[PDB]
Design an enzyme around this catalytic site. Sequence first.
Site, PDB file in Angstrom:
ATOM      1  N   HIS A   1     -77.395  22.314 137.689  1.00 37.11           N
ATOM      2  CA  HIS A   1     -78.484  21.840 136.843  1.00 37.11           C
ATOM      3  C   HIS A   1     -78.015  21.357 135.476  1.00 37.11           C
ATOM      4  O   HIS A   1     -78.386  20.264 135.014  1.00 37.11           O
ATOM      5  CB  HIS A   1     -79.539  22.909 136.600  1.00 37.11           C
ATOM      6  CG  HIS A   1     -80.726  22.382 135.864  1.00 37.11           C
ATOM      7  ND1 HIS A   1     -81.043  22.752 134.574  1.00 37.11           N
ATOM      8  CD2 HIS A   1     -81.625  21.437 136.212  1.00 37.11           C
ATOM      9  CE1 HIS A   1     -82.118  22.087 134.178  1.00 37.11           C
ATOM     10  NE2 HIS A   1     -82.491  21.286 135.157  1.00 37.11           N
TER      11      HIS A   1
ATOM     12  N   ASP B   1     -84.246  17.403 132.493  1.00 35.92           N
ATOM     13  CA  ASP B   1     -85.224  18.453 132.753  1.00 35.92           C
ATOM     14  C   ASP B   1     -86.539  18.104 132.024  1.00 35.92           C
ATOM     15  O   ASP B   1     -86.995  16.950 132.109  1.00 35.92           O
ATOM     16  CB  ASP B   1     -84.622  19.826 132.391  1.00 35.92           C
ATOM     17  CG  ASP B   1     -85.489  21.003 132.840  1.00 35.92           C
ATOM     18  OD1 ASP B   1     -85.775  21.162 134.053  1.00 35.92           O
ATOM     19  OD2 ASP B   1     -85.898  21.775 131.955  1.00 35.92           O
ATOM     20  N   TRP B   2     -87.160  19.054 131.312  1.00 37.33           N
ATOM     21  CA  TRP B   2     -88.408  18.795 130.620  1.00 37.33           C
ATOM     22  C   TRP B   2     -88.240  17.803 129.485  1.00 37.33           C
ATOM     23  O   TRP B   2     -89.212  17.194 129.038  1.00 37.33           O
ATOM     24  CB  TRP B   2     -89.024  20.126 130.149  1.00 37.33           C
ATOM     25  CG  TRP B   2     -89.653  20.839 131.273  1.00 37.33           C
ATOM     26  CD1 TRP B   2     -89.152  21.905 131.949  1.00 37.33           C
ATOM     27  CD2 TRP B   2     -90.884  20.500 131.896  1.00 37.33           C
ATOM     28  NE1 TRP B   2     -89.998  22.253 132.961  1.00 37.33           N
ATOM     29  CE2 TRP B   2     -91.076  21.409 132.947  1.00 37.33           C
ATOM     30  CE3 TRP B   2     -91.856  19.520 131.663  1.00 37.33           C
ATOM     31  CZ2 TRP B   2     -92.195  21.373 133.757  1.00 37.33           C
ATOM     32  CZ3 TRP B   2     -92.971  19.495 132.487  1.00 37.33           C
ATOM     33  CH2 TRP B   2     -93.125  20.414 133.504  1.00 37.33           C
TER      34      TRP B   2
ATOM     35  N   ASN C   1     -85.446  22.989 129.308  1.00 39.14           N
ATOM     36  CA  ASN C   1     -85.561  24.424 129.144  1.00 39.14           C
ATOM     37  C   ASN C   1     -84.194  25.104 129.022  1.00 39.14           C
ATOM     38  O   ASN C   1     -83.192  24.628 129.603  1.00 39.14           O
ATOM     39  CB  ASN C   1     -86.384  25.040 130.285  1.00 39.14           C
ATOM     40  CG  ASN C   1     -86.870  26.420 129.970  1.00 39.14           C
ATOM     41  OD1 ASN C   1     -86.916  26.812 128.802  1.00 39.14           O
ATOM     42  ND2 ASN C   1     -87.269  27.169 131.001  1.00 39.14           N
TER      43      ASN C   1
END
Length: 305
Positions: A282, A117-118, A50
Amino acid sequence: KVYDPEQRKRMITGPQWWARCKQMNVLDSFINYYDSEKHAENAVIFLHGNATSSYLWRHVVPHIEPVARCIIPDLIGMGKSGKSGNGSYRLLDHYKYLTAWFELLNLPKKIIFVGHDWGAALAFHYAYEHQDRIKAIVHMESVVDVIESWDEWPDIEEDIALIKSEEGEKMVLENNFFVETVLPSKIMRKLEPEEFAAYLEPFKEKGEVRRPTLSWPREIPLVKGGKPDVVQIVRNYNAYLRASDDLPKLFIESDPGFFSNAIVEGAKKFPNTEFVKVKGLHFLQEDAPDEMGKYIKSFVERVLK
């Protein structure tokens, strides 16, 4: 937060990156991507998550190019890719376009994935459904398993509750929460203006164009409160990964990280995992790209021998 003084010298602006990319029509739309072309007996496919796009990997990929073909898409509705035909951006919408795109790339039988992440969720689900097509998986700040508890997580429970509610449209479509708030918060350095601009550009306009950045967190696999189809997807791939004794993996931990701390014990349940660590939050590619590139290179080189 401060600019890295040596960064402007080597900065790659959005336009510089987009000029090195190409597109491929895919179903009723198209994918923008970077392809290093050479050493195509292997393929390392890097998947962002994202808020970001292929741009995220720009300083990581040069380390791996000399050993294997590197391919880096903008997920559908993100970066400079086309939009989804029906305007839906759930995990399976992304997967539909991604898998259709893979069919056109002339990939080898066994593929190396690098997911964040995704984008790791997409790699993991692809692997579950194509268990004979996987050479190795590198993952980081990834969707490793379902979520049963917020105990080890960053304090985002209410952010997520809000995002899942009608407030999510205000946060994201109106306020661009993931680009204007989350992105800089979860990079330790200050991005150069041109670097931030490359992340903003796909989502510069208000409204529906920002939908992918709202749909992604709404897929969160919360056992209590989550979309049950995504809970099933993740449960399925998690069980497969726990059993995948012969599939080499690399987990790049971010220190202090954003949710690395919450997922590392889960990542340890996947056998045949090599663990390395870099300093970051992140979006760790923006803080330790060269260290990450060298760790990935070394891992890929071992797996190819």
